[PDB]
Amino acid sequence: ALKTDQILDKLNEKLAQVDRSKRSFTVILFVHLRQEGKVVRSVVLDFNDLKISEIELAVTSTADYPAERIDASITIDDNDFYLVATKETSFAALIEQGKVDITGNKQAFLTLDEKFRNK
Ligand SMILES: CCCCCCCCCCCCCCCC(=O)O
């Protein structure tokens, strides 16, 4: 039971609205969601297939997403992910505040900030 569960439907709605004909932002981002300091759920934001999917807890890579495929990963509090997803804060703001850990290409999350703004 994550706070993030409350916004997944709306995110899926936005994904469904994305134009399929001209794809340009196609990163794979791993998201490790924390509660009380521990990772309790992991999901992939797959901008190639335009889907969010739950993956094995805290895993580094999977059959579908081997290491060489993953563009970036973030470890982030459940509530903070919810705040970004509801446009109340941004990944850049969380980085400024030292609230998240990012590996791989950090600019993928900053570009996601920009692309999510008007969606
Ligand atoms: C902050 C979490 C957001 C999770 C992503 C779900 C919201 C959908 C936003 C779609 C933005 C990506 C648009 C890509 C279009 C393109 O390929 O040019």
mmCIF file of N, CA, C and O in Angstrom, residues 9 13 28 35 41 45 49 52-53 55 61 65 67 81-82 104 106 119:
data_model
loop_
_atom_site.group_PDB
_atom_site.id
_atom_site.type_symbol
_atom_site.label_atom_id
_atom_site.label_comp_id
_atom_site.label_asym_id
_atom_site.label_seq_id
_atom_site.Cartn_x
_atom_site.Cartn_y
_atom_site.Cartn_z
ATOM 1 N N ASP A 9 -3.215 5.459 -11.794
ATOM 2 C CA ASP A 9 -4.247 5.518 -12.832
ATOM 3 C C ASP A 9 -4.108 6.765 -13.685
ATOM 4 O O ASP A 9 -4.180 6.696 -14.905
ATOM 5 N N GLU A 13 -3.280 7.162 -17.684
ATOM 6 C CA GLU A 13 -4.109 7.954 -18.560
ATOM 7 C C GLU A 13 -3.240 8.893 -19.420
ATOM 8 O O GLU A 13 -3.415 9.011 -20.625
ATOM 9 N N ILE A 28 14.493 4.204 -20.452
ATOM 10 C CA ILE A 28 14.062 3.227 -19.439
ATOM 11 C C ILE A 28 14.631 3.687 -18.097
ATOM 12 O O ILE A 28 15.859 3.812 -17.938
ATOM 13 N N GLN A 35 9.888 3.367 1.853
ATOM 14 C CA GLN A 35 9.093 3.751 3.021
ATOM 15 C C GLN A 35 9.947 3.475 4.259
ATOM 16 O O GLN A 35 10.566 2.417 4.375
ATOM 17 N N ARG A 41 8.999 -1.046 -2.992
ATOM 18 C CA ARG A 41 8.499 -1.405 -4.317
ATOM 19 C C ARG A 41 9.413 -0.835 -5.371
ATOM 20 O O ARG A 41 9.955 0.256 -5.191
ATOM 21 N N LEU A 45 9.760 2.906 -15.395
ATOM 22 C CA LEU A 45 9.100 3.861 -16.283
ATOM 23 C C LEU A 45 9.692 3.580 -17.650
ATOM 24 O O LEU A 45 10.859 3.916 -17.914
ATOM 25 N N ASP A 49 7.937 1.719 -24.599
ATOM 26 C CA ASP A 49 6.611 1.100 -24.733
ATOM 27 C C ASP A 49 5.513 1.937 -24.071
ATOM 28 O O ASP A 49 4.334 1.593 -24.149
ATOM 29 N N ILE A 52 4.268 1.820 -17.215
ATOM 30 C CA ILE A 52 4.881 1.713 -15.903
ATOM 31 C C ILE A 52 4.594 0.311 -15.411
ATOM 32 O O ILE A 52 3.436 -0.123 -15.404
ATOM 33 N N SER A 53 5.629 -0.427 -15.034
ATOM 34 C CA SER A 53 5.423 -1.805 -14.611
ATOM 35 C C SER A 53 6.167 -2.105 -13.325
ATOM 36 O O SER A 53 7.281 -1.645 -13.112
ATOM 37 N N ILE A 55 8.403 -4.341 -10.992
ATOM 38 C CA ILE A 55 9.468 -5.328 -11.204
ATOM 39 C C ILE A 55 9.862 -5.940 -9.863
ATOM 40 O O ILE A 55 9.335 -5.539 -8.818
ATOM 41 N N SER A 61 18.580 -5.142 -12.459
ATOM 42 C CA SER A 61 18.256 -5.337 -13.874
ATOM 43 C C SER A 61 17.416 -6.605 -14.002
ATOM 44 O O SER A 61 17.334 -7.387 -13.056
ATOM 45 N N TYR A 65 15.009 -5.839 -19.098
ATOM 46 C CA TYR A 65 15.828 -4.636 -18.954
ATOM 47 C C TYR A 65 17.190 -4.980 -18.368
ATOM 48 O O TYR A 65 17.412 -4.830 -17.168
ATOM 49 N N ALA A 67 21.294 -4.511 -17.760
ATOM 50 C CA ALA A 67 22.011 -3.329 -17.324
ATOM 51 C C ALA A 67 22.279 -2.356 -18.463
ATOM 52 O O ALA A 67 22.108 -1.147 -18.303
ATOM 53 N N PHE A 81 7.864 10.626 -4.666
ATOM 54 C CA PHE A 81 7.487 10.261 -6.023
ATOM 55 C C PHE A 81 6.055 10.731 -6.290
ATOM 56 O O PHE A 81 5.749 11.278 -7.347
ATOM 57 N N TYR A 82 5.180 10.506 -5.321
ATOM 58 C CA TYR A 82 3.816 11.013 -5.422
ATOM 59 C C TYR A 82 3.766 12.522 -5.638
ATOM 60 O O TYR A 82 3.003 13.018 -6.467
ATOM 61 N N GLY A 104 23.274 6.320 -13.274
ATOM 62 C CA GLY A 104 23.061 6.398 -14.699
ATOM 63 C C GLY A 104 22.942 7.855 -15.100
ATOM 64 O O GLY A 104 23.555 8.750 -14.487
ATOM 65 N N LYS A 106 21.547 11.129 -15.040
ATOM 66 C CA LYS A 106 20.713 12.059 -14.287
ATOM 67 C C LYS A 106 19.881 12.966 -15.194
ATOM 68 O O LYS A 106 18.753 13.342 -14.862
ATOM 69 N N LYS A 119 1.983 17.705 -19.653
ATOM 70 C CA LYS A 119 1.204 16.490 -19.926
ATOM 71 C C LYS A 119 0.116 16.258 -18.888
ATOM 72 O O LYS A 119 0.359 16.389 -17.704
#
